[PDB]
Amino acid sequence: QLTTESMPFNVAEGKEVLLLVHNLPQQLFGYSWYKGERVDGNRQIVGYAIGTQQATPGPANSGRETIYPNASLLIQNVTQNDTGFYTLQVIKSDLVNEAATGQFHVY
Amino acid sequence: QLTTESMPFNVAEGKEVLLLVHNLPQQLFGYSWYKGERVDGNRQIVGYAIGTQQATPGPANSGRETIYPNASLLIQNVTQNDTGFYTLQVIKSDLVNEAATGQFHVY
Ligand SMILES: CCCCCCCCO[C@@H]1O[C@H](CO)[C@@H](O)[C@H](O)[C@H]1O
Ligand SMILES: CCCCCCCCO[C@@H]1O[C@H](CO)[C@@H](O)[C@H](O)[C@H]1O
């Protein structure tokens, strides 16, 4: 089962957090991260294609995030606006996609 | 701007409806249709890989739908359960994705 978790879970303003990703499925094309609890184009942070290793920003991209080839997302110089939920959609080769939501809490 | 519309808009129970799709972006991996107004894995009707022209059913597939290469969705022998909103997500080759919602009304 695809899941994500934040390290750390409670994050001091101005520090760093890594969203770790567990149990990627076999046979995927790539990753799409979104701010909030659902898949929503208007809140897309980044898209990443695992075949070319290319990252492309979406409308909610801050410039402070880095995605890794295993879909883990690093956020640096974390702000109040970064707090709360994130949603990872994994795009499967058959287009029957999977999603996981995680969160962290800025203080 | 990606949009969809139903032909016909008001559809008699037991007849047929075609969801037409306008203004697909270029450079696409595939299409995913969902029942309702959002992208939600539990309500996915079909996923379609453009590279192979191959359709795979999701959990909401009824067996009465057919999807075409330009993302149009035909539904035959329409039921009451088919009424209302449908959402199409288009997966671009950069994994920055677009969605459009439409509806039809069964009587
Ligand atoms: C600056 C730190 C760079 C982070 C590099 C990628 C870290 C990813 O690390 C990987 O995380 C996966 C999800 O993250 C976990 O499932 C794995 O245990 C781990 O191998
Ligand atoms: C019974 C068989 C149904 C025919 C399925 C193919 C119909 C595809 O529908 C398409 O929607 C587009 C909207 O831009 C139009 O521009 C295309 O020309 C139209 O054919």
Numbering used by the authors:
A (entry chain A), B (entry chain B): 1 to 107
Text from the published report:
The E99A mutant structure revealed a GFCC′ face-mediated homodimer structure globally similar to the WT homodimer but with localized conformational differences resulting in a C-alpha root mean square deviation (RMSD) of 0.3 Å (over 1539 atoms). Interestingly, fewer hydrogen bonds (12 vs 17 for E99A and WT, respectively) and weaker hydrophobic interactions were observed for E99A homodimer. Specifically, side chain to main-chain backbone interactions between E99-G41 were abrogated and the intermolecular hydrogen bond network between residues Q89-Y34, N97-Y34, and Q89-N97 (using nomenclature convention here and after, where Q89 residue is from molecule (a) and Y34 residue in italics is from molecule (b) present in the crystal asymmetric unit) were disrupted at the E99A mutant homodimer interface. In addition, the distance between two opposing hydrophobic valine (V39) residues was slightly higher in the E99A homodimer (3.9 Å) compared to WT (3.7 Å). Similarly, we observed a CSS score of 0.63 for the E99A mutant, which demonstrated the presence of a slightly weakened GFCC′ face dimer. The I91A IgV domain adopts a GFCC′-mediated homodimer with RMSD of 0.6 Å (over 1489 atoms) compared to the WT homodimer with fewer hydrogen bonded (12 vs 17 for I99A and WT, respectively) and weaker hydrophobic interactions (specially for residue F29). Thus, the loss of important hydrogen bond interactions and possibly weaker hydrophobic interactions observed in the E99A and I91A mutant structure support the weak dimeric nature of these mutants as observed in our biophysical studies and previous reports.
